[PDB]
Design a protein around this ligand. Structure first.
Ligand SMILES: COc1ccc([C@H]2OC[C@H](C)[C@@H]([C@@H](C)[C@@H](OC)[C@@H](C)/C=C/C(=O)[C@H](C)[C@@H](C/C=C/N(C)C=O)OC)O2)cc1
Ligand SMILES: Nc1ncnc2c1ncn2[C@@H]1O[C@H](COP(=O)(O)OP(=O)(O)O)[C@@H](O)[C@H]1O
Ligand SMILES: [Ca+2]
Length: 360
C-alpha cells in the first residue's frame, strides 16, 4: 500500500503520499481551542479570536504531544483522508532531535494511530537526497528555526550541526517593525498575514548591504509598490533587502549569534578535514526562508571571503526547495534499499521504543 510522507514543520505541515510530485496538503502547525474541542490549521487561526493558539512544533522540535496528536489526527483523517492503520507513515524530525522525542513520536504512531510501519528521518538529510547527493552540507531555514547540517555518505554529522533560532517568522515580525517605523502601521495578527505576503513577493537578499542602502538613500529605483486587499497602495523601499539581511546579521533583532554564512563555515570547520572540500562544493539550500532572490550569490560571496582562496565553492539552490524535505522522504520511502529500515507493528510490539535507535 502507498506510504505516507509527513513533514512536521515549525510553521507548515507538508503531508502527502510517497511517489507524488508534491505534498497534497500544506497547512499551519497551529492548534486552537477556547463549537468543537479543537481546531487545526487554517480554521484554527481563522477563529483565532475565540481560541487559544498553540505552536507545538515551533523552533523545529515537538514540545506538546496532545497538540501534536491533534495535528497528526488532522493530517490523516481531514487532510489526506486516509486510514492511518492502512498506510506506512514516514515522519520527519528537526536536526538534533533528542532520543526520547523520536521514541515518543514512534509510540504515538503505533499505540494511538496504529500504523503498520513507520520511520523518523532528519529533515535536512531528506533535502540532500532530493538534490541527488549523499554528501554535502544543508542550510535548512524554515519558519521557526534554521539549521546547518553537514551530511557525509548519507549520514548527518551531529557534532557539526549548527542551530540558529532565526527564520522567516522572525523576519516577518522584523518586516512589520521596520515598515511601521517608516510611517505605516502593521501591528495586528491579520496584518501579519499581509506583511508575510509582501515578504514572499518583494523581498530579496542584497549582494552588498551598504551599497544597497546607499541606492535607497539617494534614489527610488529600488522601491516597489504593493496593493493591499482593501485597494490601498503602499510603497516598500530598503525594507525589501533589510528584511532577509537578518539571516546574515542576527544582531539586527538583538540576536547575538553568527549569520547563516558564518554558521555554514563553522559547521564545515567542525567536520573532519578530508571531507570539507566536498561540503564546500555541495552547499544545498532548503526551506522557504531560502527563497529570497540573490541569496545564493550572497552566500557564494560570503563563504568565499571566509574560506581559503584555493577552495572551490558551490551553492545549490533548487527551485522546489520549499518542499525539499517532503520530496526527499517521498523517494526514500519508495527506495528498495530502505524497505528493511521501516519499523513494523510487530517489531515494536516485540522490542518497544528501544528499536528506533536501530533504524533511525
Ligand atoms: C526528485 O528528483 C530526483 C532526486 C534524486 C535522484 C537520485 O539522484 C542520485 C542519487 C544517488 C539518488 C539518492 C541520493 C537517493 O536515492 C533515490 C536517496 C533516497 C538515497 C539515500 C540512501 O541511499 C541512504 C544512505 C540509505 C540509508 C538512510 C540513512 N538515513 C535516512 C539517515 O538519516 O537509504 C536507503 O537520488 C533522482 C531524482
Ligand atoms: N518566496 C518566499 N520568500 C521568502 N520567504 C518565504 C517564501 N515562501 C515561503 N517563505 C517563508 O518560509 C517559511 C516556511 O518555511 P517551511 O519550509 O515551511 O519551514 P517549516 O517546515 O519549518 O515551517 C514561512 O515563514 C514563509 O514566510
Ligand atoms: Ca522544515
Amino acid at each position: 500500500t502507498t506510504a505516507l510522507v509527513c513533514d512536521n514543520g515549525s510553521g507548515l505541515v507538508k503531508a502527502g503520499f510517497a511517489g507524488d510530485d508534491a505534498p497534497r496538503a500544506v497547512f499551519p502547525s497551529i492548534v486552537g481551542r477556547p463549537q468543537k474541542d479543537s481546531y487545526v490549521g487554517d480554521e484554527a487561526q481563522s477563529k483565532r479570536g475565540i481560541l487559544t493558539l498553540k505552536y507545538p512544533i515551533e523552533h523545529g522540535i515537538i514540545t506538546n504531544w496532545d497538540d501534536m496528536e491533534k495535528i497528526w489526527h488532522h493530517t490523516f483523517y481531514n487532510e489526506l483522508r486516509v486510514a492511518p492503520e492502512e498506510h506506512p507513515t514516514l515522519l520527519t524530525e528537526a536536526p538534533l532531535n533528542p532520543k526520547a522525542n523520536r521514541e515518543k513520536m514512534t509510540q504515538i504512531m503505533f499505540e494511538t494511530f496504529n500504523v503498520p510501519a513507520m520511520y523518523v528521518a532528519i529533515q535536512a538529510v531528506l533535502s540532500l537526497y532530493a538534490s541527488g547527493r549523499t554528501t554535502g552540507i544543508v542550510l535548512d531555514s524554515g519558519d521557526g528555526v534554521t539549521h546547518n547540517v553537514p551530511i557525509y555518505e548519507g549520514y548527518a554529522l551531529p557534532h557539526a550541526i549548527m542551530r540558529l533560532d532565526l527564520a522567516g517568522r522572525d523576519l516577518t515580525d522584523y518586516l512589520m517593525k521596520i515598515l511601521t517605523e517608516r510611517g505605516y502601521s502593521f501591528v495586528t495578527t491579520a496584518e501579519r498575514e499581509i506583511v508575510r505576503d509582501i515578504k514572499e513577493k518583494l523581498c530579496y537578499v542584497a549582494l552588498d548591504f551598504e551599497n544597497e542602502m546607499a541606492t535607497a538613500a539617494s534614489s527610488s529605483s529600488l522601491e516597489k509598490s504593493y496593493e493591499l486587499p482593501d485597494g490601498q497602495v503602499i510603497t516598500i523601499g530598503n525594507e525589501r533587502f533589510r528584511c532577509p539581511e537578518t539571516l546574515f546579521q542576527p544582531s539586527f533583532i538583538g540576536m547575538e549569534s553568527a549569520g547563516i554564512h558564518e554558521t555554514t563555515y563553522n559547521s564545515i570547520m567542525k567536520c573532519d578535514i578530508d571531507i570539507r572540500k566536498d561540503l564546500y562544493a555541495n552547499n544545498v539550500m532548503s526551506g522557504g526562508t531560502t527563497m529570497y532572490p540573490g541569496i545564493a550569490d550572497r552566500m557564494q560571496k560570503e563563504i568565499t571571503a571566509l574560506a581559503p582562496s584555493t577552495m572551490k565553492i558551490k551553492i545549490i539552490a533548487p527551485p522546489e526547495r520549499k518542499y525539499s524535505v517532503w520530496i526527499g522522504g517521498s523517494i526514500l520511502a519508495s527506495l528498495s534499499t530502505f524497505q528493511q529500515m521501516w519499523i513494523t507493528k510487530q517489531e515494536y510490539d516485540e522490542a518497544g521504543p528501544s528499536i528506533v535507535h536501530r533504524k533511525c
